[PDB]
A and B are shown apart, each in its own frame.
Chain A
């Protein structure tokens, strides 16, 4: 149906692109949390891939299973 030529260009535009936000992209604050447990009290970026962790246990967990670039 989407690929069908019967759906006109402006119809597709209004049905999919127009309904999405176009002006206000982020009005709330940006909150960064631990990639492993979502904590926020302490935050630091892993040396290898630049993703955030919060504690020694989360450090070990990320290194053992989550680290992508290594």
Chain B
């Protein structure tokens, strides 16, 4: 998975010990002790899997670590467990109702593991002999590290091998039941033992994936095209009852996951009303909601609310609150960011960055590191010194300074009333 550097690449975990007590700086996370402790409690609840339909609200001031906390929870939760992260603005679609979009998001975060035991023969082919009707007579020889035997083919196997046009001397894989043939290069690699092996393959799917697969004749393309449409509720009921029966039979297990809505303050009252009931039912994942606004008017309503959310939903949620950082934590977060971005800052440069971040914003100081690095490279210098950061500060403006400039020159910008003085004279 090759990709560039993001703003959350350094957070490789939640940084807890055995007793769920977070360390001062571990797994890329700094500070936020109580928030990380509560996030570890949530993570343990997710791993247990015995608790369903819990909503946790991650509230606090901006640039405090809500998305960082969610990313740490996701990484510590690891793979092999669903984690759906959708912004609140992704629900509003022209093809799916908001309730249907929320339902699909809810189903995406509940995983189902199905084990399929397949009999497949793997080895290095040697000879193939196919003859005309005397329907068809055929013999193939497969060599491995310790066996070399011939196989008497039948009609359909001969047809399949002719369709694949398998050559000789190339590693081949044939499935006894399905009949699929997977080609491989000449034996770096080599056959490793018995001709016919018994290895199980596990398929990880979500409830939404099963719903879409059964939705149409070839619905599994919609998982990529996105033209699923509002699935009939009877189909979902069928999926649910069959998943219950499979779990009872023991031929499939359920892996509950986490659904993360980053900007819940954009969902309307209908979405919250739907969420209230969707949480109650079984197969409901754990919903993490991140909000920042203190008291705002819920979208679709004309009244204020304690977080931009209706009181019914807040009654159903437990709130994890994040607190603003101080100078030392800003310093160590910037050091981690600089190490991630492969930038060697000096001590005085780091101190200047820390004071700038405390005065203005942590994100502003975080973004200045790469610009400072590029400025230094223009001077053919390796380490970023104070003057490079000062030039970066002079060239690029923050929110407060930009606001001050706009306020002091309000005539030359377009205002809310649509007035501007383009003419430099008069």
Contacts and interface: CB of A to CB of B under 8 A. Distances in A.
Interface of A: 41-42, 44-47, 50, 53, 55-56, 59-60
Chain A residues touching B, majority SS: mixed
B20 interface: no
27 contacts: A41-B196, A42-B195, A42-B196, A44-B149, A44-B150, A44-B151, A44-B195, A45-B149, A45-B150, A45-B151, A45-B152, A46-B149, A46-B150, A47-B141, A47-B148, A47-B149, A47-B150, A50-B150, A53-B149, A55-B194, A56-B147, A56-B193, A56-B194, A59-B146, A59-B147, A59-B149, A60-B146
Chain B residues touching A, majority SS: strand
Contacts of B146: 56, 59-60
A53 B147 CA distance: 10
Sorting the interface of chain B by its residue count into under 10, 10 to 19, 20 to 34 or 35 or more gives 10 to 19
Contacts of B195: 42, 44
Contacts of A56: 146-147, 193-194
Interface in B231-290: none
A25 B194 CA distance: 37
B263 to A, nearest CB: 57
Contacts of B194: 55-56
A45 B195 CA distance: 12
Contacts, number: 29
Contacts of A47: 141, 148-150
A44 B194 CA distance: 12
Interface string B139-155: 00100001111111000
Given A46-B149, A53-B149, 8 more contacts: A44-B151, A46-B150, A50-B150, A56-B146, A56-B147, A56-B193, A59-B146, A60-B146
A2 to B, nearest CB: 42
A53 B196 CA distance: 12
A19 to B, nearest CB: 36
Contacts of B196: 41-42
A55 B193 CA distance: 10
A56 B193 CA distance: 8
B141 to A, nearest CB: 7
Contacts of A55: 194
Nearest to A50: B150
Sort A-B residue pairs by CB-CB distance and give the 8 closest, nearest first: A44-B149, A42-B196, A45-B150, A56-B146, A59-B147, A56-B147, A56-B194, A47-B148
Interface in B158-202: 193-196
A27 to B, nearest CB: 23
A44 B152 CA distance: 8
* Most A C-beta atoms less than 10 A away, residue of B146, B147, B150, B152: B147
A51 to B, nearest CB: 10
Nearest to A54: B196
Interface string B119-158: 0000000000000000000000100001111111000000
B292 to A, nearest CB: 62
